[PDB]
Amino acid sequence: QYQSPRIIEHPTDLVVKKNEPATLNCKVEGKPEPTIEWFKDGEPVSTNEKKSHRVQFKDGALFFYRTMQGKKEQDGGEYWCVAKNRVGQAVSRHASLQIAVLRDDFRVEPKDTRVAKGETALLECGPPKGIPEPTLIWIKDGVPLDDLKAMASSRVRIVDGGNLLISNVEPIDEGNYKCIAQNLVGTRESSYAKLIVQ
């Protein structure tokens, strides 16, 4: 008959590793067949073809064969599609496409610490900012301290997101500690700090 455009599948938020491919969907319905147009941060995405890098499939999907985030190209942003035709038009949800990142400077790194048995020790670790959220693990002399868990009155435990806390300091606790952060982008390491039990 003569149905006005409808959006049957909205594009969804997406995080991608730099230079990897990416796809934002736009399943449209309408009679006449609606024409689909894409927008990035309010401006129309000059695509379809031409000597560029953003492609638009027949199903209206926006395809980045290689997602870019450099000085020249920056695909990061808010995207959305509009379906039109003689009778009307429909708009899709605005989805956000962003390239994973991992700032490489620690907010705070642990520093050498001395402490007497029984006393309480605290090693600082402020992992650098990253998206996705970076993961933070502690390593003592090459052996990763496996307590990457969460909520019991254990011995050594992480606190304030990133800081290592040792309640009753024994002598075995002596050693070199360092914390590591990581997400899709890669890995980030703080230098080694020595914990001395006097």
Side-chain angles (χ1 to χ4, degrees), residues 1-30 32-47 52-70 73-110 112-116 118-128 130-147 150 152-153 155-193 195-198:
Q1 188 37 281
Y2 253 160
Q3 68 164 344
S4 211
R6 226 178 77 187
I7 293 297
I8 88 165
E9 194 198 306
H10 291 265
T12 67
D13 297 313
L14 181 71
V15 177
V16 185
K17 184 170 299 187
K18 187 176 187 179
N19 288 317
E20 295 284 5
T23 301
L24 308 181
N25 292 302
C26 184
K27 283 272 169 54
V28 177
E29 195 184 68
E33 256 309 295
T35 34
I36 302 178
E37 200 188 327
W38 282 91
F39 296 76
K40 182 201 170 199
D41 302 318
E43 296 314 309
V45 173
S46 66
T47 182
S52 64
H53 86 286
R54 290 165 182 167
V55 155
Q56 192 193 315
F57 292 174
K58 173 189 179 63
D59 45 353
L62 212 197
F63 182 78
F64 300 74
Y65 98 84
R66 201 153 283 171
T67 304
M68 289 171 217
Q69 185 49 74
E73 291 285 67
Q74 43 283 309
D75 300 342
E78 211 70 46
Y79 289 94
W80 73 82
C81 63
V82 184
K84 294 211 305 174
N85 80 359
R86 296 220 232 69
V87 179
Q89 47 181 277
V91 194
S92 76
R93 172 235 179 66
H94 294 188
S96 77
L97 174 75
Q98 54 188 332
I99 300 68
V101 312
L102 183 49
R103 205 46 265 300
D104 46 7
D105 288 320
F106 279 67
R107 186 196 82 198
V108 186
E109 285 188 50
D112 295 297
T113 302
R114 288 189 180 61
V115 58
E119 277 184 49
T120 306
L122 194 86
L123 304 187
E124 280 185 295
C125 180
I131 170 175
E133 249 301 294
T135 311
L136 176 142
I137 208 174
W138 277 90
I139 284 190
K140 175 191 172 187
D141 301 309
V143 192
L145 307 178
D146 293 310
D147 53 293
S153 300
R155 175 68 175 307
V156 170
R157 85 199 62 189
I158 299 184
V159 64
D160 227 325
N163 295 295
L164 189 60
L165 165 59
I166 299 175
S167 63
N168 181 305
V169 166
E170 289 179 51
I172 200 161
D173 298 358
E174 292 215 75
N176 296 294
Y177 295 73
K178 80 176 175 192
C179 60
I180 303 179
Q182 68 164 52
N183 58 17
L184 317 164
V185 189
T187 274
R188 256 59 169 178
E189 287 182 45
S190 71
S191 37
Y192 267 119
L195 175 59
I196 309 178
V197 188
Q198 286 173 293

PDB file of all heavy atoms in Angstrom, residues 148-167, unseen atoms left out:
ATOM      1  N   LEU A 148      41.901 -11.142  42.873  1.00  0.00           N
ATOM      2  CA  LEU A 148      41.259 -10.240  41.930  1.00  0.00           C
ATOM      3  C   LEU A 148      39.742 -10.331  42.177  1.00  0.00           C
ATOM      4  O   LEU A 148      38.924  -9.855  41.374  1.00  0.00           O
ATOM      5  CB  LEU A 148      41.609 -10.655  40.492  1.00  0.00           C
ATOM      6  N   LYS A 149      39.392 -10.939  43.315  1.00  0.00           N
ATOM      7  CA  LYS A 149      38.004 -11.136  43.740  1.00  0.00           C
ATOM      8  C   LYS A 149      37.384  -9.893  44.398  1.00  0.00           C
ATOM      9  O   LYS A 149      37.837  -8.762  44.188  1.00  0.00           O
ATOM     10  CB  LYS A 149      37.928 -12.334  44.704  1.00  0.00           C
ATOM     11  N   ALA A 150      36.333 -10.121  45.183  1.00  0.00           N
ATOM     12  CA  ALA A 150      35.635  -9.051  45.894  1.00  0.00           C
ATOM     13  C   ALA A 150      34.917  -9.639  47.121  1.00  0.00           C
ATOM     14  O   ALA A 150      35.186 -10.784  47.516  1.00  0.00           O
ATOM     15  CB  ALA A 150      34.628  -8.360  44.956  1.00  0.00           C
ATOM     16  N   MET A 151      34.021  -8.853  47.724  1.00  0.00           N
ATOM     17  CA  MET A 151      33.259  -9.289  48.901  1.00  0.00           C
ATOM     18  C   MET A 151      32.493 -10.593  48.624  1.00  0.00           C
ATOM     19  O   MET A 151      31.313 -10.731  48.957  1.00  0.00           O
ATOM     20  CB  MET A 151      32.283  -8.174  49.341  1.00  0.00           C
ATOM     21  N   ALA A 152      35.354 -11.303  53.316  1.00  0.00           N
ATOM     22  CA  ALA A 152      35.873 -12.178  54.362  1.00  0.00           C
ATOM     23  C   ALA A 152      37.140 -11.551  54.928  1.00  0.00           C
ATOM     24  O   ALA A 152      37.908 -10.938  54.191  1.00  0.00           O
ATOM     25  CB  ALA A 152      36.172 -13.566  53.791  1.00  0.00           C
ATOM     26  N   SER A 153      37.354 -11.701  56.234  1.00  0.00           N
ATOM     27  CA  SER A 153      38.540 -11.134  56.887  1.00  0.00           C
ATOM     28  C   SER A 153      39.833 -11.869  56.481  1.00  0.00           C
ATOM     29  O   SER A 153      40.416 -12.643  57.266  1.00  0.00           O
ATOM     30  CB  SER A 153      38.373 -11.147  58.420  1.00  0.00           C
ATOM     31  OG  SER A 153      37.238 -10.392  58.841  1.00  0.00           O
ATOM     32  N   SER A 154      40.271 -11.615  55.245  1.00  0.00           N
ATOM     33  CA  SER A 154      41.484 -12.222  54.697  1.00  0.00           C
ATOM     34  C   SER A 154      42.717 -11.520  55.262  1.00  0.00           C
ATOM     35  O   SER A 154      42.650 -10.860  56.299  1.00  0.00           O
ATOM     36  CB  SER A 154      41.476 -12.128  53.170  1.00  0.00           C
ATOM     37  N   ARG A 155      43.843 -11.655  54.575  1.00  0.00           N
ATOM     38  CA  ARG A 155      45.081 -11.036  55.032  1.00  0.00           C
ATOM     39  C   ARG A 155      45.388  -9.780  54.230  1.00  0.00           C
ATOM     40  O   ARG A 155      45.269  -8.657  54.726  1.00  0.00           O
ATOM     41  CB  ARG A 155      46.226 -12.034  54.888  1.00  0.00           C
ATOM     42  CG  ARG A 155      47.581 -11.457  55.223  1.00  0.00           C
ATOM     43  CD  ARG A 155      47.741 -11.127  56.703  1.00  0.00           C
ATOM     44  NE  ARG A 155      49.105 -10.676  56.989  1.00  0.00           N
ATOM     45  CZ  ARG A 155      50.212 -11.346  56.657  1.00  0.00           C
ATOM     46  NH1 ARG A 155      50.134 -12.513  56.019  1.00  0.00           N
ATOM     47  NH2 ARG A 155      51.407 -10.845  56.955  1.00  0.00           N
ATOM     48  N   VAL A 156      45.802  -9.994  52.987  1.00  0.00           N
ATOM     49  CA  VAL A 156      46.118  -8.908  52.071  1.00  0.00           C
ATOM     50  C   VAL A 156      44.884  -8.703  51.192  1.00  0.00           C
ATOM     51  O   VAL A 156      44.316  -9.670  50.686  1.00  0.00           O
ATOM     52  CB  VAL A 156      47.345  -9.269  51.184  1.00  0.00           C
ATOM     53  CG1 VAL A 156      47.510  -8.249  50.072  1.00  0.00           C
ATOM     54  CG2 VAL A 156      48.605  -9.312  52.038  1.00  0.00           C
ATOM     55  N   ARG A 157      44.456  -7.453  51.029  1.00  0.00           N
ATOM     56  CA  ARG A 157      43.285  -7.171  50.207  1.00  0.00           C
ATOM     57  C   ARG A 157      43.371  -5.817  49.521  1.00  0.00           C
ATOM     58  O   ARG A 157      44.028  -4.907  50.018  1.00  0.00           O
ATOM     59  CB  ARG A 157      42.003  -7.251  51.052  1.00  0.00           C
ATOM     60  CG  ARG A 157      41.608  -5.989  51.816  1.00  0.00           C
ATOM     61  CD  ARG A 157      40.630  -6.344  52.935  1.00  0.00           C
ATOM     62  NE  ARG A 157      41.268  -7.245  53.902  1.00  0.00           N
ATOM     63  CZ  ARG A 157      40.640  -7.873  54.894  1.00  0.00           C
ATOM     64  NH1 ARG A 157      39.330  -7.709  55.069  1.00  0.00           N
ATOM     65  NH2 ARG A 157      41.324  -8.661  55.718  1.00  0.00           N
ATOM     66  N   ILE A 158      42.718  -5.695  48.369  1.00  0.00           N
ATOM     67  CA  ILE A 158      42.721  -4.451  47.625  1.00  0.00           C
ATOM     68  C   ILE A 158      41.675  -3.554  48.255  1.00  0.00           C
ATOM     69  O   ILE A 158      40.667  -4.042  48.763  1.00  0.00           O
ATOM     70  CB  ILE A 158      42.383  -4.687  46.148  1.00  0.00           C
ATOM     71  CG1 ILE A 158      43.431  -5.612  45.533  1.00  0.00           C
ATOM     72  CG2 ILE A 158      42.354  -3.358  45.396  1.00  0.00           C
ATOM     73  CD1 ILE A 158      43.257  -5.857  44.047  1.00  0.00           C
ATOM     74  N   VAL A 159      41.928  -2.247  48.241  1.00  0.00           N
ATOM     75  CA  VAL A 159      41.005  -1.282  48.823  1.00  0.00           C
ATOM     76  C   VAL A 159      41.109   0.058  48.107  1.00  0.00           C
ATOM     77  O   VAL A 159      42.157   0.399  47.562  1.00  0.00           O
ATOM     78  CB  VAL A 159      41.290  -1.095  50.341  1.00  0.00           C
ATOM     79  CG1 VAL A 159      42.671  -0.499  50.554  1.00  0.00           C
ATOM     80  CG2 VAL A 159      40.240  -0.212  50.964  1.00  0.00           C
ATOM     81  N   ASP A 160      40.009   0.804  48.111  1.00  0.00           N
ATOM     82  CA  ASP A 160      39.935   2.118  47.474  1.00  0.00           C
ATOM     83  C   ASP A 160      40.308   1.992  46.004  1.00  0.00           C
ATOM     84  O   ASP A 160      41.005   2.856  45.450  1.00  0.00           O
ATOM     85  CB  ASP A 160      40.885   3.116  48.157  1.00  0.00           C
ATOM     86  CG  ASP A 160      40.218   4.468  48.448  1.00  0.00           C
ATOM     87  OD1 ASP A 160      39.371   4.904  47.635  1.00  0.00           O
ATOM     88  OD2 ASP A 160      40.552   5.097  49.486  1.00  0.00           O
ATOM     89  N   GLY A 161      39.851   0.903  45.391  1.00  0.00           N
ATOM     90  CA  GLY A 161      40.126   0.657  43.985  1.00  0.00           C
ATOM     91  C   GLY A 161      41.566   0.863  43.523  1.00  0.00           C
ATOM     92  O   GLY A 161      41.916   1.919  42.967  1.00  0.00           O
ATOM     93  N   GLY A 162      42.411  -0.143  43.753  1.00  0.00           N
ATOM     94  CA  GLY A 162      43.792  -0.039  43.323  1.00  0.00           C
ATOM     95  C   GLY A 162      44.872  -0.127  44.380  1.00  0.00           C
ATOM     96  O   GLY A 162      46.003  -0.493  44.064  1.00  0.00           O
ATOM     97  N   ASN A 163      44.547   0.201  45.628  1.00  0.00           N
ATOM     98  CA  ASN A 163      45.546   0.151  46.693  1.00  0.00           C
ATOM     99  C   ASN A 163      45.622  -1.182  47.429  1.00  0.00           C
ATOM    100  O   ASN A 163      44.607  -1.798  47.757  1.00  0.00           O
ATOM    101  CB  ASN A 163      45.304   1.281  47.686  1.00  0.00           C
ATOM    102  CG  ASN A 163      45.511   2.647  47.066  1.00  0.00           C
ATOM    103  OD1 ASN A 163      46.624   3.002  46.663  1.00  0.00           O
ATOM    104  ND2 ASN A 163      44.432   3.422  46.977  1.00  0.00           N
ATOM    105  N   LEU A 164      46.854  -1.621  47.670  1.00  0.00           N
ATOM    106  CA  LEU A 164      47.105  -2.882  48.357  1.00  0.00           C
ATOM    107  C   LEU A 164      47.271  -2.602  49.844  1.00  0.00           C
ATOM    108  O   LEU A 164      48.048  -1.739  50.240  1.00  0.00           O
ATOM    109  CB  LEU A 164      48.369  -3.553  47.801  1.00  0.00           C
ATOM    110  CG  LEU A 164      48.617  -4.975  48.302  1.00  0.00           C
ATOM    111  CD1 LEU A 164      47.436  -5.836  47.912  1.00  0.00           C
ATOM    112  CD2 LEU A 164      49.900  -5.529  47.712  1.00  0.00           C
ATOM    113  N   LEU A 165      46.528  -3.339  50.654  1.00  0.00           N
ATOM    114  CA  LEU A 165      46.555  -3.177  52.095  1.00  0.00           C
ATOM    115  C   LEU A 165      46.931  -4.490  52.771  1.00  0.00           C
ATOM    116  O   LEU A 165      46.351  -5.537  52.492  1.00  0.00           O
ATOM    117  CB  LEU A 165      45.175  -2.703  52.572  1.00  0.00           C
ATOM    118  CG  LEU A 165      44.802  -2.767  54.055  1.00  0.00           C
ATOM    119  CD1 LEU A 165      45.775  -1.936  54.852  1.00  0.00           C
ATOM    120  CD2 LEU A 165      43.374  -2.269  54.255  1.00  0.00           C
ATOM    121  N   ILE A 166      47.921  -4.423  53.652  1.00  0.00           N
ATOM    122  CA  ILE A 166      48.384  -5.589  54.392  1.00  0.00           C
ATOM    123  C   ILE A 166      48.212  -5.270  55.881  1.00  0.00           C
ATOM    124  O   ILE A 166      48.962  -4.462  56.440  1.00  0.00           O
ATOM    125  CB  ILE A 166      49.873  -5.888  54.087  1.00  0.00           C
ATOM    126  CG1 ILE A 166      50.055  -6.197  52.601  1.00  0.00           C
ATOM    127  CG2 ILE A 166      50.342  -7.087  54.882  1.00  0.00           C
ATOM    128  CD1 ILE A 166      51.503  -6.378  52.191  1.00  0.00           C
ATOM    129  N   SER A 167      47.219  -5.909  56.504  1.00  0.00           N
ATOM    130  CA  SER A 167      46.889  -5.708  57.916  1.00  0.00           C
ATOM    131  C   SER A 167      48.020  -5.999  58.896  1.00  0.00           C
ATOM    132  O   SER A 167      48.635  -5.077  59.434  1.00  0.00           O
ATOM    133  CB  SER A 167      45.687  -6.559  58.283  1.00  0.00           C
ATOM    134  OG  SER A 167      46.012  -7.923  58.118  1.00  0.00           O
TER     135      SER A 167
END
